Structures are given as structure tokens and as C-alpha cells.
Amino acid sequence: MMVWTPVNNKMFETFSYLPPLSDEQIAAQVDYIVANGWIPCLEFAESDKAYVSNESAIRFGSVSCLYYDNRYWTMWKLPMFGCRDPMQVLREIVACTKAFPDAYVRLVAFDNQKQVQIMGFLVQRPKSARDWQPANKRSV
Template identity: 40%
Template sequence: MADMQDYKSSLSDVTSRKFETFSYLPEMTTEQTRKQVEYIVSKGWNPAVEHTEPENATSSYWYMWKLPMFGETDVDVILGEAEACHKAHPNNHVRLVGYDNYAQSKGAEMVVYRGKPV
């Protein structure tokens, strides 16, 4: 266990904060992000896009980008909405959520664009 890595994160350093499981891994490539969206679609979960300022990312409230995409199965449409949100709010973090209707909770959640602190 001596090889365990400590992640240096703090409230004062906005860029060091972790938000979900994928935050502890290297940034996903476009293809890896696509695979995650394909997984959300394959599970029948409803995708949604959310965003917030980096300094507010640890709060439980993120802004909803449009309405959740109920029943959307086209991966390109979902990725296009995430990109449109990022273009409209380039300094904000943008995350993709997969809502599980059966469990009535989030089945997946990942930051797909990291904003720059102002």
C-alpha cells in the first residue's frame, strides 16, 4: 500500500478539485467520452447536460442546459448539446448526466469540459 497516491486538492485551489470518479483519471479523449455516452444510451438512461462556474462546482446545484434529453439515443446529438453548452459558457465546467428512470437517480455523471477559473 505504500504506492498509494494522495491527491492534493483544496478549496483554495479551484483547479485541484475533484468532482466525480473520472476526475481522478487522466482527461478522457473524445473517443472515450463517446463510449461513455454510448453506455448511457445503451442502459436506456436519459441524458442531460449541466454546467457551473469552477468556483461553485462543489455545491450541489449546477445549472441545467435546456431540458433533459428524454428518450434521446443519438450519441452525436447528445455530444453536440454538451459542446453547445461549452461554447455558450466557455469558462464553466460542463457535465453529462445519465438519469436512470427505474432507480430514479443518476446512473452516470461526468465532467466533459473543465472551465477555467476567472
């Protein structure tokens, strides 16, 4: 039996348990978003604002239930309303990551009917990050 390492094994929600997504797999997800008429959008954050925290709760009474800091990230430009071209999305991913090379960047998509994010996955992790493991080192 292999042991799942509890050290430097941070995840990033949807698809983080699969091997790193290839450009092709990412493009496929983008085609999925556009084909379904959803609204693509990019969000980013510096390292200290990447994972949920409880900092603000110091100002709270007994109302911390389901409150966490760092869930909100910074929006890159605006949601791509009316986008029907996967290429425009790939272009923005390049622009965003180029502008913030040391920040975490994630691609999301919105459904305005249910009014909720219907997809999301990390597309960039800073190079200096040492809190995660490659697919083959998640268990020892």
C-alpha cells in the same frame, strides 16, 4: 514512495482519478448511456458554484447533516428524454460548452426506473482554473 499532493489537487467524482478522458472515451460513455436507455442531460456552473460548501448552514439549527450547497448545478435546456442517438448528445455538449466557455460543465444520465442519476463526469473545466493537477503531478 511518492507523496499525494494536498495542494491544488481538486477532483470531480467519477473518472477524475483516471487520465483526462479523450473524446473517444467520452463518446464510449455516451454510447453506454444510450445503449442502456438512460436519459442524458448536461449541467453547468460558474467557478464559485462548482464545489460543495457550507454557506447556508449559518441559518441552521443543528440540522446540517448531509446538507451542502453547490450540489445542484444549472440544467442545460432539458434532459434528453427519448434520446437514442449518441450524436445528439455530443452536439449538445458542444452547444453548452460554447455558450458557457468559462463554466464547469458535466454530463449526467438519469434512470427513471430507479429514479436516480446513474452516471456523471466532468466534460469542461474553465481555462482559468488552477486548483487541479495533471495526472502526472498528482503525487511528488
